[PDB]
Motif scaffolding. Structure first.
Motif: not given
Lengths: 56, 49, 55
Positions: A1-28
């Protein structure tokens, strides 16, 4: 597993969150467009009311 | 090893750009939304008087 | 059929930007694929191979 994969999965989580902020800003901010419109339309209503009262 | 930082920063930068597009497209829709609303309501107010 | 060889836990899955994939290599070229693992294409995850079967 080499741990960097988990950091990239957290970068996917943050990537989804960032675009979700823009969706939430739009909805408000969609209701700000209606609140701004409600402020403008009252000015025309008051103007025509005052003009009608002047004709009376 | 170093390349995982770049691989994150790449998908993170795509997310930055995608969020900024949605933030732009939001304001573009709100200018259309006020254009639909205010003129229609003004015309209804004028038709009433 | 790989159905007795591999399980979900052996892969990166359910992701937007990473995938785990399977490669078959001659036993003699094992060390050549190890030399190439870090280098064969861009944006490969470094130092994260895993042999799941040998024949």
């Amino acid at each position: 597993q080499s741990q960097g994969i988990q950091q990239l999965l957290q970068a996917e989580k943050r990537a989804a969150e960032k675009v979700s902020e823009a969706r939430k800003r739009k909805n408000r901010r969609l209701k700000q467009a209606k609140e701004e419109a409600q402020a403008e339309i009252e000015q025309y209503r008051l103007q025509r009311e005052k003009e009608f009262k002047a004709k009376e | 090893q170093k390349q995982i930082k770049h691989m994150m920063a790449f998908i993170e930068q795509e997310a930055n750009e995608k969020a900024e597009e949605i933030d732009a497209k939001a304001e573009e829709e709100f200018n259309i939304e006020k254009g639909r609303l205010v003129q229609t309501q003004r015309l209804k107010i004028m038709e009433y008087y | 059929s790989l159905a007795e060889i591999v399980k979900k836990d052996d892969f990166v899955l359910d992701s937007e930007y990473l995938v785990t994939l399977l490669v078959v290599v001659p036993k003699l070229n094992h060390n050549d694929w190890i030399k190439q693992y870090e280098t064969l294409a861009e944006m490969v995850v470094p130092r994260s191979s895993n042999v799941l079967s040998e024949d």
